[PDB]
Design a protein around this motif. Structure first.
Motif, PDB file in Angstrom:
ATOM      1  N   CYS B 282     -12.657   6.629 123.533  1.00 38.95           N
ATOM      2  CA  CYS B 282     -13.960   6.855 124.212  1.00 38.95           C
ATOM      3  C   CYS B 282     -14.078   8.310 124.692  1.00 38.95           C
ATOM      4  O   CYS B 282     -15.076   8.953 124.368  1.00 38.95           O
ATOM      5  N   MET B 283     -13.083   8.813 125.423  1.00 40.04           N
ATOM      6  CA  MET B 283     -13.055  10.218 125.908  1.00 40.04           C
ATOM      7  C   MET B 283     -13.094  11.189 124.722  1.00 40.04           C
ATOM      8  O   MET B 283     -13.805  12.209 124.806  1.00 40.04           O
ATOM      9  N   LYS B 284     -12.345  10.911 123.658  1.00 40.04           N
ATOM     10  CA  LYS B 284     -12.308  11.792 122.461  1.00 40.04           C
ATOM     11  C   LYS B 284     -13.700  11.822 121.836  1.00 40.04           C
ATOM     12  O   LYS B 284     -14.136  12.919 121.478  1.00 40.04           O
ATOM     13  N   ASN B 285     -14.390  10.682 121.741  1.00 39.95           N
ATOM     14  CA  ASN B 285     -15.780  10.642 121.213  1.00 39.95           C
ATOM     15  C   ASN B 285     -16.666  11.557 122.058  1.00 39.95           C
ATOM     16  O   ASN B 285     -17.407  12.390 121.481  1.00 39.95           O
ATOM     17  N   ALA B 286     -16.609  11.378 123.385  1.00 37.60           N
ATOM     18  CA  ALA B 286     -17.384  12.154 124.383  1.00 37.60           C
ATOM     19  C   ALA B 286     -17.105  13.664 124.235  1.00 37.60           C
ATOM     20  O   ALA B 286     -18.057  14.467 124.285  1.00 37.60           O
ATOM     21  N   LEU B 287     -15.845  14.062 124.052  1.00 41.92           N
ATOM     22  CA  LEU B 287     -15.467  15.496 124.037  1.00 41.92           C
ATOM     23  C   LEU B 287     -15.966  16.088 122.715  1.00 41.92           C
ATOM     24  O   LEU B 287     -16.492  17.219 122.709  1.00 41.92           O
ATOM     25  N   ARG B 288     -15.832  15.329 121.626  1.00 38.68           N
ATOM     26  CA  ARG B 288     -16.333  15.774 120.304  1.00 38.68           C
ATOM     27  C   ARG B 288     -17.858  15.890 120.385  1.00 38.68           C
ATOM     28  O   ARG B 288     -18.369  16.907 119.914  1.00 38.68           O
ATOM     29  N   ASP B 289     -18.542  14.895 120.972  1.00 36.33           N
ATOM     30  CA  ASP B 289     -20.012  14.881 121.222  1.00 36.33           C
ATOM     31  C   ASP B 289     -20.431  16.145 121.974  1.00 36.33           C
ATOM     32  O   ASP B 289     -21.493  16.688 121.680  1.00 36.33           O
ATOM     33  N   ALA B 290     -19.635  16.591 122.939  1.00 37.19           N
ATOM     34  CA  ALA B 290     -19.944  17.787 123.744  1.00 37.19           C
ATOM     35  C   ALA B 290     -19.588  19.078 122.981  1.00 37.19           C
ATOM     36  O   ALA B 290     -19.993  20.127 123.460  1.00 37.19           O
ATOM     37  N   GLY B 291     -18.861  19.028 121.860  1.00 36.47           N
ATOM     38  CA  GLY B 291     -18.416  20.237 121.130  1.00 36.47           C
ATOM     39  C   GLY B 291     -17.382  21.010 121.933  1.00 36.47           C
ATOM     40  O   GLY B 291     -17.420  22.259 121.928  1.00 36.47           O
ATOM     41  N   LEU B 292     -16.474  20.309 122.612  1.00 40.14           N
ATOM     42  CA  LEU B 292     -15.514  20.929 123.560  1.00 40.14           C
ATOM     43  C   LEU B 292     -14.078  20.858 123.025  1.00 40.14           C
ATOM     44  O   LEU B 292     -13.669  19.854 122.382  1.00 40.14           O
ATOM     45  N   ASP B 293     -13.334  21.903 123.351  1.00 41.11           N
ATOM     46  CA  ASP B 293     -11.855  21.891 123.442  1.00 41.11           C
ATOM     47  C   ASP B 293     -11.517  21.064 124.678  1.00 41.11           C
ATOM     48  O   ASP B 293     -12.063  21.343 125.737  1.00 41.11           O
ATOM     49  N   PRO B 294     -10.624  20.052 124.592  1.00 42.12           N
ATOM     50  CA  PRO B 294     -10.261  19.231 125.744  1.00 42.12           C
ATOM     51  C   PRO B 294      -9.705  20.072 126.901  1.00 42.12           C
ATOM     52  O   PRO B 294      -9.801  19.620 128.023  1.00 42.12           O
ATOM     53  N   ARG B 295      -9.141  21.253 126.611  1.00 43.53           N
ATOM     54  CA  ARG B 295      -8.613  22.156 127.665  1.00 43.53           C
ATOM     55  C   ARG B 295      -9.741  22.707 128.553  1.00 43.53           C
ATOM     56  O   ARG B 295      -9.405  23.336 129.582  1.00 43.53           O
TER      57      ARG B 295
END
Ligand SMILES: C[C@H]1CCO[C@@H]1C(=O)Nc1cnns1
Lengths: 412, 412
Positions: B282-295
């Motif tokens: 779920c978090m990985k989907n959200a971070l990819r959706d935002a176009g973000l580096d998780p850092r």
């Protein structure tokens, strides 16, 4: 741009049958599923009849142990969902399970379970409340249990928009696929509110037909003698699928979901406005969504609840949207036969709209003996009418002035 | 093509205050809103405390005559929505009312109302059921009543996804705006499940803390002495707005909603998987959706319910998503103070996540005296931590294995 969405699987429990083909046979024969409600003392109630699911066998779907944990509305939802997935021929794998989700809703949820645990609580206090009370009663457990049983890891949610639930569920599931959030969704709704709280609650608002002497004639959309809706139970589930995904695995495609419309009346809590302005904006939204001209619509599965103000509002909205085509399209209410399945209404009526496309037949509005003032459209009174149907609409207009329209087209 | 979405208005009832700023002051000072419940006799119950809304005056918003017909969950929903709309500066006109909708959700909805009408039905009979039972109890009527009072004619719906409801309501309302279905949405959720059936049902499942002798210390996310969640009441509403629409009217923008994730666990009706695998997806989907580096993630508002299995699952999910950066970001559970608002949890926590961005401070996890096995991250034990926050993530996980993540960032 947007991906195309097709129907590859359908499932149903209705007052007419325990699957789609039996239910659809009832519809085309103009048969009523309405009867006095059994194994329940309704002496003190002004309404004693409704659309019950007859001979449902949950052990075809679940172990007795898993079924004991789950409200009837959840059981019915799972039944339609399992039928629909089986009907689709879809194989879930590790390669696709993250792309398969669920949106099965309900208008009222776990009243029967709430009733029985209230009995325990009032009689014996809180220590007799079932451990499975909460997860066995909450609306998102059809989506929850289905996702667990089939290993579905895609978007998992539930809508609750009263009598609009099934229409919104199918519509928003189609959006998930169109915008690439999922490749497959199981969508629809389920309802079992023929308990004391449902019959009593709607009864208290005097929203129900009280025609106890002739239950099969109670539901009579656009008839001058209608006196409110008939409460019914059941479920509808559709497998929605991206077109290329469906073609690649050789799926049977029933039809294409081309359009979805939403609107709010912003008028009254239970009553539509007389001109149906909100239903009109919603149908116009749906046709624009589908890039279609009102002239291309051949069939409307009306909301058609058999309430005085609701039936007349839908006529005003159809004449407003369709102008000089309003008399050319055929519009019927299958609630004349099924009664009002509330949150499942839109699900079973989307399935009937898809089957009207497959079979090239408008289902009847039965009991339409004496159309009311200005109810002069082709309402398919009494008997099924074979005709050309390229484009079918399904409308749902619910409490809070919440409206949904689905647009289906023949696929080839 | 996909439009950007900003927050221009917020509103709240919580156990910490009757608005956002009073609630937020409580969060930053580490104050508990948990207390023995006074609105009923809980001597027979194994849990006798929760987060009550204290001193709520419905006559700040609605006539006593209208409020009388509505469950507290609807009253709380309307209060928060009204606050959020006023706070937005938005004016509703004929030019924009079709482009403004509402998605206010609930986990359980009008349980108090359904219980009271159940007591009337069982002790007296169906003739004593309120005529307002259905429209005053069902979950979609926050959206319904709000649209009627403000004249909102846009998409009108409600989610019910148990403890994920608030996050899903906010995320899907953003998608509506992102995809052009609306320019403004009022979204979030409301809950008031502190009746016999609520405290009794969660009690029957042994899901609740029974720390009756020290209620303010009951909710202790990641603490080794935690013994279940604390049940809490309230509402969160945000006004979501298309960016250019906001810019065009000179709106004050709190922050940008850049990311939304959903996933199903497909694991268990009520238990999360120990490894947090569905939360991680779920978090990985959200971070990819935002176009973000998780850092880029600086702050996580955890679900953090104070259950043994829930809390450990989240740590494992965060460590799997963020690897070594899991040691650099700050994660806290405001449920340490507010308790668990169920369907409203995601709505109030989305607001806390935006305020964390406005004020550049991580709220504390109070009562984290002895962090449990593997709970070795910055969990902001005891005291608010001022720090750089460009990106804030808010997680919710629910019954049915349903997961939601929202990603917010500062807007320049
Ligand atoms: C701090 C909040 C609560 C009290 O006054 C503020 C408010 O927004 N009141 C509203 C009344 N009606 N619509 S908004």
């Amino acid at each position: 741009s947007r991906r195309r969405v097709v129907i590859t699987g359908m499932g149903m429990l209705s007052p007419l049958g325990l699957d789609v083909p039996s239910s659809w046979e009832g519809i085309l024969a103009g048969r009523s599923g309405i009867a006095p409600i059994e194994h329940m003392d309704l002496s003190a109630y002004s309404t004693r009849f409704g659309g019950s699911v007859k001979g449902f066998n949950v052990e075809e779907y679940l172990s007795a142990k898993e079924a004991r944990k789950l409200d009837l509305f959840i059981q019915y939802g799972l039944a339609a969902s399992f039928q629909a997935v089986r009907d689709s021929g879809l194989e879930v794998t590790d390669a696709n399970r993250e792309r398969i989700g669920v949106s099965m809703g309900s208008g009222i949820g776990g009243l029967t379970n709430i009733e029985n645990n209230c009995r325990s609580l009032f009689e014996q206090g809180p220590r007799r409340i079932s451990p499975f009370f909460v997860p066995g009663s909450i609306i998102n457990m059809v989506s929850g249990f289905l996702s667990i049983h089939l290993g579905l890891q895609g978007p998992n949610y539930a809508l609750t928009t009263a009598q609009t639930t099934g229409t919104h569920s199918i519509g928003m599931a189609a959006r998930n696929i169109a915008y690439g959030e999922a490749d497959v969704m199981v969508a629809g709704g389920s309802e079992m509110a023929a308990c004391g709280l449902g019959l009593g609650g709607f009864g208290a608002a005097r929203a129900l037909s009280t025609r106890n002497d002739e239950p099969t004639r109670a539901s009579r959309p656009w008839d001058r003698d209608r006196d409110g809706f008939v409460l019914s139970d059941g479920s509808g589930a559709l497998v929605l699928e991206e077109l290329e995904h469906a073609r690649a695995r050789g799926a049977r495609i029933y039809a294409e979901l081309v359009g979805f419309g939403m609107s709010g009346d912003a008028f009254h809590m239970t009553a539509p406005p007389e001109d149906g302005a909100g239903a009109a904006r919603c149908m116009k939204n749906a046709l624009r969504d589908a890039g279609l001209d009102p002239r291309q619509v051949d069939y409307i599965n009306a909301h058609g609840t058999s309430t005085p103000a609701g039936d007349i509002a839908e006529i005003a909205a159809v004449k407003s949207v369709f102008g000089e085509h309003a008399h050319a399209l055929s519009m019927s209410s299958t609630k004349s036969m099924t009664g009002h399945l509330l949150g499942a209404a839109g699900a079973v009526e989307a399935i009937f709209s898809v089957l009207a496309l497959r079979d090239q037949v408008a289902p009847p509005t039965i009991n339409l003996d004496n159309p009311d003032e200005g109810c002069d459209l082709d309402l398919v009174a009494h008997e099924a009418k074979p005709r050309k149907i390229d484009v079918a609409l399904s409308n749902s207009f619910g409490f809070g002035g919440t409206n949904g329209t689905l647009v289906f087209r023949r696929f080839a």
